[PDB]
Short mmCIF file of all heavy atoms in Angstrom, two decimals:
data_model
loop_
_atom_site.label_atom_id
_atom_site.label_comp_id
_atom_site.label_asym_id
_atom_site.label_seq_id
_atom_site.Cartn_x
_atom_site.Cartn_y
_atom_site.Cartn_z
N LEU D 127 54.13 -73.15 4.77
CA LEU D 127 54.81 -72.30 3.75
C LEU D 127 54.41 -70.83 3.87
O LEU D 127 55.20 -69.94 3.78
CB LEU D 127 54.43 -72.86 2.35
CG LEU D 127 55.21 -72.24 1.18
CD1 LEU D 127 55.58 -73.37 0.23
CD2 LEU D 127 54.31 -71.17 0.49
N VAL D 128 53.06 -70.61 4.08
CA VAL D 128 52.64 -69.22 4.19
C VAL D 128 53.17 -68.52 5.43
O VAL D 128 53.59 -67.35 5.44
CB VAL D 128 51.04 -69.18 4.20
CG1 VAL D 128 50.58 -67.82 4.69
CG2 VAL D 128 50.52 -69.44 2.80
N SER D 129 53.20 -69.32 6.55
CA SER D 129 53.70 -68.71 7.81
C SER D 129 55.17 -68.35 7.67
O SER D 129 55.61 -67.25 8.09
CB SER D 129 53.51 -69.72 8.96
OG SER D 129 52.11 -70.03 9.00
N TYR D 130 56.04 -69.25 7.13
CA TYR D 130 57.39 -68.96 7.04
C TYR D 130 57.69 -68.02 5.91
O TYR D 130 58.80 -67.39 5.86
CB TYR D 130 58.24 -70.24 6.90
CG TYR D 130 58.62 -70.81 8.21
CD1 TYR D 130 57.73 -71.61 8.93
CD2 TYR D 130 59.86 -70.55 8.82
CE1 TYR D 130 58.06 -72.12 10.20
CE2 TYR D 130 60.20 -71.07 10.07
CZ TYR D 130 59.25 -71.87 10.72
OH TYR D 130 59.56 -72.37 11.94
N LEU D 131 56.76 -67.87 4.99
CA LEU D 131 56.99 -66.80 3.92
C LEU D 131 56.68 -65.40 4.52
O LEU D 131 57.32 -64.44 4.18
CB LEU D 131 56.13 -67.10 2.78
CG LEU D 131 56.27 -66.15 1.48
CD1 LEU D 131 57.56 -66.59 0.75
CD2 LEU D 131 55.08 -66.22 0.60
N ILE D 132 55.66 -65.32 5.34
CA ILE D 132 55.27 -63.97 5.89
C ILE D 132 56.16 -63.56 7.02
O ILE D 132 56.37 -62.42 7.30
CB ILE D 132 53.78 -63.93 6.27
CG1 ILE D 132 53.42 -64.88 7.33
CG2 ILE D 132 52.95 -64.19 5.06
CD1 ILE D 132 52.11 -64.76 7.96
N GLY D 133 56.69 -64.54 7.79
CA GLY D 133 57.64 -64.19 8.82
C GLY D 133 58.97 -63.66 8.29
O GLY D 133 59.51 -62.78 8.80
N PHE D 134 59.48 -64.36 7.23
CA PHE D 134 60.76 -63.97 6.62
C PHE D 134 60.60 -62.97 5.49
O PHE D 134 61.58 -62.64 4.81
CB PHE D 134 61.41 -65.23 6.06
CG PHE D 134 62.42 -65.83 6.98
CD1 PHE D 134 62.13 -66.72 7.95
CD2 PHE D 134 63.76 -65.45 6.84
CE1 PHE D 134 63.06 -67.26 8.79
CE2 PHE D 134 64.72 -65.96 7.71
CZ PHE D 134 64.38 -66.91 8.69
N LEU D 135 59.38 -62.42 5.28
CA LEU D 135 59.18 -61.43 4.20
C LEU D 135 59.97 -60.12 4.44
O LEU D 135 60.59 -59.63 3.47
CB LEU D 135 57.71 -61.16 4.06
CG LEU D 135 57.17 -60.20 2.95
CD1 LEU D 135 55.94 -60.71 2.31
CD2 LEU D 135 56.94 -58.84 3.56
N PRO D 136 59.90 -59.53 5.64
CA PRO D 136 60.55 -58.15 5.77
C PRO D 136 62.04 -58.16 5.56
O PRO D 136 62.56 -57.04 5.22
CB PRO D 136 60.19 -57.80 7.18
CG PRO D 136 59.92 -59.04 7.87
CD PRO D 136 59.32 -59.96 6.89
N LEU D 137 62.76 -59.26 5.68
CA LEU D 137 64.21 -59.22 5.48
C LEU D 137 64.50 -58.92 4.03
O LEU D 137 65.47 -58.19 3.74
CB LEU D 137 64.78 -60.64 5.80
CG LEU D 137 65.00 -60.94 7.37
CD1 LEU D 137 63.74 -61.18 8.09
CD2 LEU D 137 65.95 -62.05 7.50
N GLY D 138 63.78 -59.48 3.06
CA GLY D 138 63.98 -59.22 1.66
C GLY D 138 63.16 -58.07 1.01
O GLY D 138 63.17 -57.95 -0.21
N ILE D 139 62.48 -57.28 1.86
CA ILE D 139 61.73 -56.16 1.33
C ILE D 139 62.11 -54.87 2.11
O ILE D 139 62.25 -54.91 3.34
CB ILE D 139 60.20 -56.45 1.33
CG1 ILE D 139 59.83 -57.50 0.35
CG2 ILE D 139 59.45 -55.21 1.12
CD1 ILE D 139 58.37 -57.89 0.36
#
Side-chain angles (χ1 to χ4, degrees):
Chain D
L127 188 139
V128 166
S129 305
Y130 272 82
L131 186 77
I132 62 170
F134 263 88
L135 183 140
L137 282 72
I139 291 180

